[PDB]
Amino acid sequence: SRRGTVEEKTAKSDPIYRNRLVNMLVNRILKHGKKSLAYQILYRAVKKIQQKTETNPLSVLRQAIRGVTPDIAVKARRVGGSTHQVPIEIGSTQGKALAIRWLLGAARKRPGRNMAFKLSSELVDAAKGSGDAVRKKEETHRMAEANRAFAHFR
Amino acid sequence: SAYNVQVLVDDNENEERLLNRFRREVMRAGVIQECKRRRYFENKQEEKKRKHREAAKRNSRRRRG
């Protein structure tokens, strides 16, 4: 990636809901490229989240990702022979990426039975701000602010 | 009492203009360069090096421009 940058790729829409977001999450949930299974898992997650609460799940998505989206993180810099943690600010696409990822990660580590149950458990816990995927983001902020002194681009 | 740089702030004050006026005062008297210079000690040789270097720098910057 030294020379050429990256051209933009078509942002798709999930077939049932016509969403860019839901399609993002069904792509990141994917393993061994069986879309057949991923769509099923995610739709039964929407089914259990509409089962547990009567609120529109289309909104619980935006609450879940607004909830776990880091606005800042750190990065390792080599400056003056000193190895620094420098709080580099995060782009939007990268924010949604990180979001979906810690969500999915904490979703794969749950004690439960199905994956639809786990994903719904964690969308329910992130939309209230009540769980590991929000906690993780807040830790990234805690370690961003303790290191706030090392950003000279401030 | 004594002073090097005098910046008097009027009541038209905004932060950026004050900050840059002061920055150019410090640049004008050359103070930070001066206290980086007197931080450590120099033999006559590094003094001649600094004289030729800096003087020919600003002098060639006057003769080219």
């Binding site: 080599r78 400056v79 003056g80 022979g81 | -």
Partner: protein, 116 residues
């Protein structure tokens, strides 16, 4: 061989040649010094012996020792020597190793202030 080096893998391979007890002990000694002081970095010592000349082949009697070091972090320390006697060859390789090693330790472990 050494206890403080117990964490290190000393691999002694005759290529065309038969390894004796004196060659063993000598390898342990001369590689021993080389590595011992720098032990914290070092990982695996690979020593191959290649003999040629005299009654085996054409050309002078050459015994050639190749060694290879790896460190926990940096890899590829390569040392190639040609000489008369096995013993001489080993002494040569150890002379090289020492230098390359303490060059690595020098670079990295100096808290070298590298500003850029």
């Amino acid at each position: 061989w050494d206890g403080p080096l117990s964490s290190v893998k000393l691999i002694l391979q005759g290529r065309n040649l038969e390894v004796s007890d004196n060659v063993r002990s000598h390898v342990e000694d001369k590689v021993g010094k080389s590595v011992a002081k720098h032990s914290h970095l070092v990982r695996e010592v690979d020593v191959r012996l290649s003999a040629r000349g005299g009654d085996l082949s054409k050309g002078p009697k050459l015994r050639r020792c190749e060694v290879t070091l790896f460190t926990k972090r940096h890899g590829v320390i390569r040392a190639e020597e040609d000489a008369e006697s096995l013993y001489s060859s080993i002494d040569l390789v150890s002379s090289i190793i020492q230098r390359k090693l303490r060059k690595i330790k020098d670079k990295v472990s100096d808290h070298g202030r590298h500003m850029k």
